[PDB]
Amino acid sequence: PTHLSVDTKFKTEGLCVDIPGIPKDMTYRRLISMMGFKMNYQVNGYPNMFITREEAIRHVRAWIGFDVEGCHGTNLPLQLGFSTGVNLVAVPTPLMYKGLPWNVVRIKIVQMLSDTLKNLSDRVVFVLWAHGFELTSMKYFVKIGPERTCCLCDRRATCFSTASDTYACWHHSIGFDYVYNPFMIDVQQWGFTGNLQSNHDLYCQVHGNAHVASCDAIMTRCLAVHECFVKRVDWTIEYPIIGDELKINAACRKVQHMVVKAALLADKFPVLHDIGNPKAIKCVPQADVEWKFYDAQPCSDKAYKIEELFYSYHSDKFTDGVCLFWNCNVDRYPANSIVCRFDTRVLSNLNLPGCDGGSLYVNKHAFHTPAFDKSAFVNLKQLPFFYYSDSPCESHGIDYVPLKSATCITRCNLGGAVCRHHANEYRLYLDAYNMMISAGFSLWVYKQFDTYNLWNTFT
Ligand SMILES: C[C@@H]1CN(C(=O)COC(F)F)C[C@H](C)O1
Ligand SMILES: [Zn+2]
Ligand SMILES: [Zn+2]
Ligand SMILES: [Zn+2]
């Protein structure tokens, strides 16, 4: 109960237009053999080219939608499309490349997958809506065998080179021509009525159909993300650390404490309505305020309607005091809000393309986030950068260049010169803030927010 048994049945109805006469009774073992791959009864870490839905969810960073369309099948050219937007034409003799033989097409496939995946995953998972030509084209660019390590490092092998007879990971495969031990999953095996477009269009209006293979590849991965991360949610699955995860999460905690502490000091709200994570803790535990929590899990489909979160009969009066929405995605924030909203458009190794404008943000856990929409912030303004501290000016225990800044809200800056301690803390805070912003988080606040009101907390 870990891998997909090769003896599991494979429904072949979707394959019978490309492969007429295909047997209805089919296993992964017989299908893999039909594809031209010999498994030789190998107990060396690669029991099946195909994987379970559960294993595919654990390796979502490796997902590459793949489709093959007949341009004209041994005699006809094939259009190979990938969810990266690339279309390659292979001759047997939205980027669109002209027809070239397989020996050069396979070098491009390896280069493209390596650049897309080296900072995301240790493997590739081809996400298919299998009709036949994609499965039969794999023998022209895929090699299989025992699990291996890279020739230049300790990572698992993802590529093979016929020129040198060596194996490489995604980071060391320059000049390699074969994809080695890829994984794959057929979305058609999940139980669907109707074609790819009809199922995809039920949940997404952002991916159209220009009738090229890459359009189908994108729609296939999109539908798979919808099924595994939008209609079904598993927040218990852990994902490996691949970048700045720990620094981003630490920065998020620091920024939240800073902004909320300052909003309470500047406007002295008698009550704070904390809307979001049912396991949230008070981000400013020493604040005088009446802290009230409201449970809402992360929305993965569409943003919450403020009318459903707040109305239908709690302080009841959400208009009293301030509302804190820390990564709680709503359609239109109330005017009295402090907000952190993840911008789905951000380019990063943590943020993967999602469904209907949304993105899949993977940092320890996977969170499909609804599309970022600027109109949600109409009653608020962007929160300006600032650093506030009421801690004593005392160095304790890296060198020094005098800090001059209008945004260092400290007693030392009020009285002229910034002390070394507050200058060090200001620089660390600025780095944390820039880290969080660059990760894709955006901050918004009630229009009356004014850091000028923080200087009088030093009297
Ligand atoms: C396009 C060149 C030439 N090549 C072949 O044509 C041999 O391919 C054969 F061994 F599979 C190998 C090299 C990696 O790319
Ligand atoms: Zn390597
Ligand atoms: Zn889509
Ligand atoms: Zn100071």
Side-chain angles (χ1 to χ4, degrees), residues 130-202:
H131 55 263
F133 293 151
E134 72 294 286
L135 293 181
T136 69
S137 78
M138 267 162 195
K139 69 174 75 80
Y140 302 112
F141 66 99
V142 170
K143 284 298 178 60
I144 72 161
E147 279 292 271
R148 292 172 183 268
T149 75
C150 181
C151 65
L152 292 170
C153 83
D154 287 326
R155 299 181 181 92
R156 92 178 263 278
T158 57
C159 312
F160 167 76
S161 177
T162 62
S164 57
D165 201 350
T166 61
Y167 299 88
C169 71
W170 302 127
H171 297 273
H172 300 118
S173 67
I174 186 158
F176 281 51
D177 57 340
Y178 277 85
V179 173
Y180 186 75
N181 279 13
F183 302 95
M184 53 203 76
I185 187 157
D186 179 25
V187 174
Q188 292 221 248
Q189 304 301 313
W190 300 353
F192 282 105
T193 304
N195 65 16
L196 168 65
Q197 181 160 28
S198 82
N199 284 283
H200 166 271
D201 293 2
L202 285 173

Side-chain angles (χ1 to χ4, degrees), residues 265-310:
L265 289 173
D267 294 273
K268 314 177 169 59
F269 300 105
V271 54
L272 184 149
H273 310 281
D274 204 340
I275 307 123
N277 202 265
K279 289 319 293 179
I281 224 279
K282 280 199 216 175
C283 63
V284 187
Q286 308 293 284
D288 211 339
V289 74
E290 180 167 9
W291 212 289
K292 299 187 184 206
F293 295 100
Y294 306 84
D295 298 351
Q297 291 291 8
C299 51
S300 49
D301 195 345
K302 303 268 98 266
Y304 289 115
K305 292 177 202 168
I306 194 72
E307 326 295 330
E308 70 197 353
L309 281 181
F310 284 5

